[model samples]
Every structure is written in C-alpha cells, then in structure tokens.
Target: GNHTVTFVNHTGQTIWLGSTVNADGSVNFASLPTLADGQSATVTIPETSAPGHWRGKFFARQGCTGTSGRDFHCLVGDCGVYADHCATGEQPASLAEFNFDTADGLAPWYDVSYVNAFSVPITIEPVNAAVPPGSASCGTAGCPENLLPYCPAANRQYSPSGTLINCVNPNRDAPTSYSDAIKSHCPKAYAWSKQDTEPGNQTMYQCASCTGFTITFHRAS
Candidate 1:
C-alpha cells in the first residue's frame, strides 16, 4: 500500500514545502522542493518506509528571501534555520496532517488545521478513491476562504506598511474574538486547538480506501 502525495501551488508566488515526521522528526522519505506559482511536486511513500504507520504534517513557507544556495528566512511557517529542511516544528501557519496505517485495512485519516494560523489556502482530498455518497468521511478538508480582511485586529499579523498578511490563532486556552471570526468563516477547520471537542464538531476526515492524497495551496479566494 504505497502512497503518493502531490502538492500543487497556485499562490502566485514561490512557496517552499516542509514536512516533519512525528515519530522521529525524520524527513528522509521526501525532499523539500521549492515550487513557483502553478508548479507542483510529488513524493512517494513506499509501504516499508515507516513500517506500521506514519504520522506527520506538511506546510508551506511564504514571503521568503535569502542567499539562493544558502539559508532562507520566511515571514510565515518557518520551521528551521535552513530552507531545505523542517528541522523543527511549524510556526503559525495552515497545516495538512496525515496518519497513514498500511496494515489497518482502513483508509488514512487527514485534516486541514488552522489551529496555528493560515498563510495560504489549503485543501486535502483523496485521489482516485471511492467516496460513499452523502458520507461525511472522505470529503475534502480545508479553509478556502480569504480571512485576512476579516481577522480580528488583535490577531492580525501585519507587515511594515501595516498591511495584514496573516492571522494568529488565539488557541484553545485563550479563545477570543479572533477564534470566533475564523470559525464563522471556516467551520471545517480548527479555529482553535481544541475545536474538535468544543461542544459539537468534527474536523478530521477519514477514508476507508484511497490510492493517494493531494494537497493544494493557493491564495485565498
């Protein structure tokens, strides 16, 4: 049950991809690629790569600049000092999470999480998979709306010219007007870290069968 994950970039700017394997912070299975607008890349996960299951996340880095062959710095989702590797965890940015079990006989579990924040729009969907009609499972998960204009003032990340560029999650412990605004706009994404249990909610999606998955990033529409 090998799997291939394809990433598409439609953000009208270059984006650097990053991945972190939760088990041990290893990213040997995939090489980070820098994608220009409208470009895409794919990484194949061989069945034997992670043994039983593999858990990790993928995110995009935006507004970056540095020496072409050296370290790069980004305004959002910077994971490490080097641009080619996610040496650490993510910053405040949209995340595509996945947990794949090769022997479980069940499809992978995946979700789009804004529990951190959002730098670009992201969607996760199964590729060539059978989705039961009217079933909640196997549906795409994402926050496709542009939220910068609607972000609460206190949670807005701004540039030198005072232009809003991103939003910061208030998180579960400090739910605020910021969280509410995000929830109202993107109900299926995690407005805060604990949104899945905040009364009634289901953000994670699962599929019983799927050949692969695709993650697309674009400017908010």
Candidate 2:
C-alpha cells in the first residue's frame, strides 16, 4: 500500500529536489522541487503496472550557502534505506565539515631544557643583542617584526648589538615582556639563531667574546 511519500530538509537552508523514480522503473517526477530551509513536502505515487514491489529513488539539489551547499537528495520506500546519496558522480554542492582540531593545541605540552656548557665562561649581562626589530615574520616572510626590545627591569641590561638600558623595575612583575627582558638580561645565555617552536617561550642570544650557547626547555603541562 504505497500511497503517499513525504520528504523533509532538517538543515537550516533551502533544498532542491531534482527527480524521483518509481518501483516499476517509471520516472514519476523529473522536475525538481525547491523546498525552503527546514521545510517538508509529500508526494503521491499511483500504482501502475508494478504492484508487489514499490521502490523509489530521489535526487536532491542542496542549497548553495553555508556548509551543506547544494548536494541533497531523498529516498523513500523499501529501497530508500540503502541508497547511495553521494554516488551520483556529482560534485559536493555544499562545503565539507570545518576541521580545527590541530589549531586548538589540546595536545600535551612537551618538555624543553637549556644549559650553558661552553668551555669558556660567558658573561650574560642584562643587555644582550637580539634579532633586529622588523627583521622577519616566522612561517611567512621572515622573523617577527616586533622582536622583543632590550629591557632591564630586574638587573643591568646590555644588548650584544650595543643597546643598553637600566633595570628600572626589579620586581619582574606581570605584563612584562619576557622576550624583551631575556634579550637584555640573559642574551648570551640564549641564542636567537636557534629555531623557536613556541613564541611564548624565551630565547637566548650571545654577544661577541661570549661563547654562545642555547638551552632546550620543555613544558611540563
């Protein structure tokens, strides 16, 4: 008793129904119907030469916005349960799912450590040379333009590039740019030439006559 067939679009956008085929292999509705977003409709399939077997196939054209785009379709009756909606060789009308699992940084933080193991003891003054500002932006053109400037808030600071400043605030309080502070205080202890995976971590650079060394530090989190 295949009397009426109903269709629905559960998504938030309009859907286009292209065609429908009946059980007796007769094309019933070749003209597609456009359904507004979140709408439903029913169609009556009259009994023809075929009786015992009532199979139906439907093709839908999905909306052309959002992620689902224009690839949509429906199947009803005994055959509807096992229809291949995407096997029509038609390009996916809508956009695929948005994936941002890599950007979340949910992975556990690995460990990194550093040590100054140079044979000659190097003097790590508060002021040490840093990669010049406006140098480059990482992963794009070059290093970052706003490379930390030399600062001496906790001690006497001197840059290997000869930029020097006094440690006005020794409290080492929050909001202090550690990049700038490390550039000034522990410049020789940290080398900027070493590749950096995380900008939030500190880098070490060295000056002339100072045996340059780098320490590998890791996050316990």
Candidate 3:
C-alpha cells in the first residue's frame, strides 16, 4: 500500500525539498525534489512494510546557493550544503507533517507544524477526500495567509536583503507571545510544539478514506 503525496511550488522561487523520517524505523524517503516556480511533484509513500505506514515531515528550502560544503545554504529552511539532498537536520522551517497509520478505521493524520519557526505558509489537504472540507473529517490544515509579515519584531528573521523570511519562537513547549501571534494569524495550524495538547485544539486532522494529500508552500508576505 502507498499514499501519494503531491507537493506544489507556488512561492515564485525555486525550492529544494527536505524531509526526515522519525527515528523509530519508519520508512525514509530516499530523496525529494527540487522544483521551480509553479511546478509540482508527486511521490509515493510505501506503507506496507513492518511499520505499515510512513511517518515524517517535509519542508521547502529556498534562497539556496553554492554547490556544496559551507557555501551551499538556504536563507530559510537550511538543512545542509547539498544542492539536491539534505545532509543533516533542517533549520527552523515550516513543516508539513504526516503519520500514515494502517489501522482499519482511523489512519493518516496530518498537520502543519510551526513548532519553533515558520519560514513560509504551508497547508495540507486530502485529495478527493471522502468527507467535507468544512467538517471535522478530513478538513484542510493550515491557511493561505503568509504569516511571516505579522511576526513580532523580537522574533522576526530577515534575509540578506532585509526581507522577513521567517518567524522564530523563543519558546516551543508552551504558549508565548510569539505563539499567540502565530495562532492569531493562522489558528488551524500548530503555533507551538504542544498546541495539540491544549483544550479544544484544532491543530491536527485525519483522513482514512482519501487516496492521497496535497501540500503547498506559499511565499512569505
């Protein structure tokens, strides 16, 4: 079994995809993609192995330069110096996360993670979902708003040209002014690390009857 995950690059910039599977022996994506503006790529997540599912998060790396070593890096979502693949853990970038379960009834939970930083606006939605988008079943996670612009001055991360590229959160485990501001900007996504544990939190979504999912990364505003 496999689930197809489609990624669309609409940020008006080239992006090299980055991903990491959990250390629990979950399936790891051998490689990701590098897409130009308005391009899309779909990959399959093999889910019939020992674990029965794939668990990981994917992000986009932009403003990349250089070929390798210390020279190659992204202004946002810098993972390593590699031009085609990541060499290490990613820097603080917005994440589109997933846990594809093999359970009978409930499986395939997903979310938009801004645990400590948000480099761009990212969203996740079930493709040809069985349930309504507005309902609790298979609703879209994250929003279209380019939230980096509203970041507080204290947590704002800028590019070389003085462009606000990311919003950094000093604290991740609990709520803070930074988290609150992000929540205010995009309530359907995770603002902090433990937001899903909060009462009446809407930071996560699930879908079992869907065939696949679409993840999109928007330009920073």
Candidate 4:
C-alpha cells in the first residue's frame, strides 16, 4: 500500500484520476496511478497530498457521469498519462532581486530580505532615477561635482568615482569620493518597502562604485 505512483495504459480509452481543492482547503492529484485503456496501475498516497503543491491533468472516462464529486484525486485504479493536467492554470508571480551598495542609502540603513519564491504578490520598483543628485562643491583633493566641467547640468556625472572624476564607465564607477559622496546625494536609486517601511521585509537598491556613478534594481513583473 506504499506504491506512490505507477501506470501503463496502452490507450484503448477510459481514464480518470482525482483530487482538487485549494484556496486554502488543500488537496491535489491528477494522476498518481491512473492507467486504463490497455490498463495498468499502482498508486499510493496514504499521507502526502493536498495544497502542499501538486500540479494536475489526467483523464479517460467511459460512461457513468453520476456521482463525480469532482473527485479530488479519484480513480483508485485506471487513468493514464501524467506530468501535469488537472485544469487550473495561471497563478504565478512572486519574484525578487535586491542588491544595494553605496553604503545602502546611508545613515544607519538596514533592510534586506526578499525571497518570494512565487505564489503571487509582487510590485518592486527602481531601475534608475530616484532624484538625489544635487549638492557638489568639488575641488580640494576631491574633484567630483558630477565631474566638474563647471558642475550643475543637474549635477552631471552618474558615478564612477573621483580624484577628478575619470569614471565614464570603468565598469560603472564609485570607488571613492567617499563612494562618490554616497552616489551624489542619494536618489541614484532607492528601494525598500515590502509593506511600507520599518523593516517591511527587506530589499534596498543600488550597486556599483569604483570611481563614480552607479545604481540598480530589476525584476518587475
């Protein structure tokens, strides 16, 4: 009685496997040992079976359509072809990706815990432009008022580093200038709001600093 699953139906016709009930109730099965056409079976589920997660799809009916009960893992004997088929699709969306650097936004910043393996619930944003790029009074063994060519153009330079701001993309810059003055003030990128603050679940964006500008974030679906 510990068979688990085993089938072999040559396809003469007549199949049906069972189980169904989710949304919290739990219970799933489309094929555990269903094989009937040529016929063959061997299934077992004395314990494991339910909202625990078990995709579906498996059938082959003959005649009697009376007490169908919509069987949640039915067919104590014949029902073939397995590997997904229970009819209940479209329901997958939880994804996560957080990698912040630049002193994690500064002034005692903490929040990093995003592991939504998927089941639904995802909004994450921030791929660039959060706004903090304004104050810079370059010169003085520093040289990086956004690469100073006279500073201003909204503060220029998106991060690479300093000593004179030679970072155009030495791979994205930010090595010093005290991490490019904390990526030029801050909105070079920002993210952290799982439920709206106070360690909501973690996740803070931005990463890249060798000589100048850098920030990042992705996985928006």
Best by TM-score: 3
lDDT of 3: 0.86
Best by lDDT: 3
* Candidate models: Cα lDDT each: 0.77, 0.28, 0.86, 0.26
Report the Cα lDDT for residue 3, model 2: 33
> Whose TM-score is higher: candidate 1's or candidate 2's?
1
Q: After superposition, how far is residue 192 of candidate 1 from its true place, in Å?
A: 1.4
Backbone clash tally for model 1?
0
Candidate with the larger TM-score of 2 and 4: 2
- Model 4 compared with the native: what TM-score? 0.19
Candidates 2 and 3, the one with greater lDDT:
3
List candidate 1 segments past 4 Å from native.
24-30, 68-71, 172-174
- Is 1 or 3 the stronger prediction by TM-score? 3
C-alpha lDDT of residue 121 in model 2: 15
Give the clashing pairs for model 3.
none
lDDT of 1 by residue, 30-133 (tens): 36899998999988765556465777888898877885446667778877777777767777888888877776666588888877886777888889888678
Instruction: Kindly report which residue stretches of model 3 are placed more than 4 angstroms away from their true locations once superposed.
Output: 132-135
Using lDDT as the yardstick, the better of models 3 and 4 is 3
TM-score order, best first, reads 3, 1, 2, 4
Model 4 per-residue lDDT at 84: 31
TM-score per prediction, in order, is 0.89, 0.26, 0.93, 0.19
lDDT of 4 by residue, 1-221 (tens): 11132333432443343333335432344443334455655433222333222222122222112233344332211122232334443111111222212223321111211111111112222222233466221111111122223223332332232222111211122233322332343222211122223243123433221121111111111
TM-score pick, better of 3 and 4: 3
